[PDB]
Amino acid sequence: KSPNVLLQNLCCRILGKSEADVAQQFQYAVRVIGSNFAPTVERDEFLVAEKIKKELTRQRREADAALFSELHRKLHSQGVLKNKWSILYLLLSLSEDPRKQPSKVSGYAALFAQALPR
Amino acid sequence: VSRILPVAASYSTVTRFIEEKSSFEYGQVNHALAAAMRTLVKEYLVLVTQLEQLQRQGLLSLQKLWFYIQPAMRSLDILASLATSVDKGECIGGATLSLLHDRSFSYTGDSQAQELCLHLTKAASTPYF
Amino acid sequence: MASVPQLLDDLCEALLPAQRRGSRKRAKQSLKKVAYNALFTNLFQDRLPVKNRILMLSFDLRVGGLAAEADRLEELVEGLELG
Amino acid sequence: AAAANLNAVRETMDVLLEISRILNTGLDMETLSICVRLCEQGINPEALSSVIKELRKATEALKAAEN
Amino acid sequence: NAVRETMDVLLEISRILNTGLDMETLSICVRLCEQGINPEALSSVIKELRKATEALKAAENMTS
């Protein structure tokens, strides 16, 4: 239940090995986590969803984007958490694109929008 | 507000210019320019909406907006300068590409403007290419 | 290394800061008796990797705004690497 | 009430599973809740995402080394 | 000197752990652990004895 206990168990699962077997990996992850414990950018799921849809279109997955938007509507209807933005950011960072070949154009955040920090 | 007004004036000019260069008689080149500008305008409007979300949070200041509008002001200035150049030069085609290379050498040195113009130039020369 | 009662009495008197001098002697004896009772209870009644536990402690410090103290303790632990 | 909580958790988990399958993230069910709920304690989303990416890279390296 | 330095490092770690453990207690604990005493048993007895010592100190302060 402790954040450290959760980290140890998650490292064991990610490595498929013991926590002591991931102790060095666990140590690196612990260093990374204690480096920053809170997000430096606020939670505004409108922009997060906009980025998700933009990525889906960049993946030529407009139908999948519509399915995702409908899922977002259903999930916000089943809202049970208050900081979903972080979970959404995690899902976007965990997202992979086997549906498209690897080639992308760089976006902007200062010509485009940069997250005003929280 | 007058200082902020510059970016909004750029927004209005961009709306007008993306409408004007949207015509097929303005060319598919001008159409692509307006489409890329529309993507950028979508980014700007999304930023505006996020700021409006902060205003619904009641947590925005003229400094905060202006500071948040500072990079936005710079981006809008770059885009609006490009639009004003395209309209005043009426470039359509190889002249447009030549002006693109010229203005890219002129916006060289500023990495934000240089990178945005590089993306726009690649996208716009894709059709002529 | 001493007799379990001997070391228990030494440690109990160490915790004990010890009215009459007979009262002080009785307080020391009571501390020894309580320690003996606790040890007997533990015996009659009778995990995480130590590296993992130290990692959890340092993570708690760094989360608790003690990232520097976590680093100091981690340095002590790494020098250690009794359990 | 607790059955309602369990049902809601299952529904949220199913929604998240669908979101993950649509994102093609490759994240496993083991990060059903443990991954999200641990970050729900207020973890830095960027740091947590970076840690997850590092774990994924290390796991891929470990799988390649085992193979 | 090796035992003393190890005890000093362990005491530094414990002070970082905010345990308020004594060096004499550290040496006694080292002896017990080499003797085969459960760390859990030692720590539980330590906590119980610390509580008892605190209660006795409070009582004697009211008993002055």
What DSSP string describes D20-50?
HHHHT----GGGTTHHHHHHHTT--HHHHHH
Q: How far apart are CA C28 and CA E56, in angstroms?
A: 10
A13 near D51, Cβ under 8 Å?
no
C58 near A31, Cβ under 8 Å?
no
Burial profile B43-69: b = 16 or more Cβ within 10 angstroms, e = fewer: bbebbbebbebbeeeeebeeeebeebb
β-sheet bridge partners, residue A117: A41
B78 near A111, Cβ under 8 Å?
yes
Task: For E12-30, give the DSSP string.
Answer: HHHHHTT----HHHHHHHH
Q: How far apart are CA A92 and CA D49, in angstroms?
A: 9
D20 near D27, Cβ under 8 Å?
yes
The half-sphere exposure of B120 on its side-chain side, counting CA atoms within 13 A, is 32
With CA atoms as reference, report the closest residue to A1 among D16, C58, C56. Answer: C56
> B66 at the A interface (CB within 8 A)?
no
Cα-based angle A34, C63, C52 (whole degrees, multiple of 5): 75
B50 near A98, Cβ under 8 Å?
no
Q: How far apart are CA B118 and CA B112, in angstroms?
A: 10
Indicate left, alpha or beta for A60 from its phi (over 0: left) and psi (-120 to 50: alpha): left
Cα-based angle B18, B22, B27 (whole degrees, multiple of 5): 125
- B75 CB neighbour count, 10 Å cutoff: 26
> D32 at the A interface (CB within 8 A)?
no
Structure tokens at B43: 């980014």
DSSP state of A114: P
> A37 at the B interface (CB within 8 A)?
no
- In this complex, whether E and C touch, counting 3 or more CB pairs under 8 angstroms, is yes
DSSP state of C17: -
Please report how the helices C21-45 and C4-15 are oriented relative to each other, as an axis angle in degrees rounded to 10: 130
Q: How far apart are CA E57 and CA C17, in angstroms?
A: 7
With CA atoms as reference, report the closest residue to A54 among A107, A111, A115, A116. Answer: A107
Q: How far apart are CA E53 and CA D19, in angstroms?
A: 58
Cα torsion through A29, A30, A32, A34, rounded to 10: 160
B106 near B100, Cβ under 8 Å?
no
Q: How far is A104 from chain D (nearest CA, A)?
A: 17
Cα separations in angstroms, B15 against B34, B42, B73, B80, B100? 9, 11, 16, 10, 21
Please report how the helices E23-35 and C4-15 are oriented relative to each other, as an axis angle in degrees rounded to 10: 160
Q: Which residues of A touch C51 (CB under 8 A)?
A: 20, 23
> B71 at the A interface (CB within 8 A)?
yes
Q: How far apart are CA A49 and CA A84, in angstroms?
A: 12
Q: How far apart are CA C67 and CA E59, in angstroms?
A: 39
DSSP state of A113: P
Any chains having at least 3 CB pairs less than 8 A from chain C are A, E
- B114 CB neighbour count, 10 Å cutoff: 16
Residue D36: partners with Cβ closer than 8 Å, 6 or more residues away: A87, A90, D16
- CB-neighbour burial class of residue D29 (10 A; exposed 0-12, middle 13-18, buried 19+): exposed
- C40 CB neighbour count, 10 Å cutoff: 10
Give Rg (Cα) of chain E. 14
Q: Do E16 and C30 touch (CB under 8 A)?
A: no
> A44 at the B interface (CB within 8 A)?
yes
Please report the resolution in angstroms.
6.8
With CA atoms as reference, report the closest residue to C50 among E40, E50, E5, E21. Answer: E40
Q: How far apart are CA A75 and CA D14, in angstroms?
A: 10
Q: How far apart are CA B70 and CA B54, in angstroms?
A: 16
Give Rg (Cα) of chain C. 19
Structure tokens at C66: 């003690």
Closest chain A residue by Cα to residue B67: A116
β-sheet bridge partners, residue A41: A117
Indicate left, alpha or beta for B93 from its phi (over 0: left) and psi (-120 to 50: alpha): left
- Tell me how long chain D is: 67
With CA atoms as reference, report the closest residue to D52 among A52, A6, A80. Answer: A6
A43 near A118, Cβ under 8 Å?
yes
Residue A78: partners with Cβ closer than 8 Å, 6 or more residues away: D8, D11, D12, D15
With CA atoms as reference, report the closest residue to A43 among B66, B50, D49. Answer: B50
Q: How far apart are CA A37 and CA A30, in angstroms?
A: 10
Backbone angles phi, psi at A117, to 5 degrees: -65, 150
Residue A110: partners with Cβ closer than 8 Å, 6 or more residues away: B71, B74, B75, B112
E38 near C4, Cβ under 8 Å?
no
D62 near A19, Cβ under 8 Å?
no
Q: Which residue has the tokens 């030494």?
A: C10
Q: Which residues of C touch A23 (CB under 8 A)?
A: 49, 51-52, 55
Q: How far apart are CA A40 and CA A37, in angstroms?
A: 9
Q: How far apart are CA E64 and CA E56, in angstroms?
A: 12
Please report, as a single letter, which amino acid is at residue A11.
C
Which stretches of chain A are DSSP H helices? 3-15, 23-35, 45-58, 62-77, 84-94
Structure tokens at A103: 């080639």
Q: How far apart are CA A90 and CA D47, in angstroms?
A: 10
Cα-based angle B86, B92, B98 (whole degrees, multiple of 5): 75
Backbone angles phi, psi at D22, to 5 degrees: -70, -40
With CA atoms as reference, report the closest residue to C30 among D42, A102, E25, E56. Answer: E56
> Helix or strand or coil: residue A36?
coil
Which stretches of chain B are DSSP H helices? 5-20, 27-56, 62-89, 94-106, 111-128
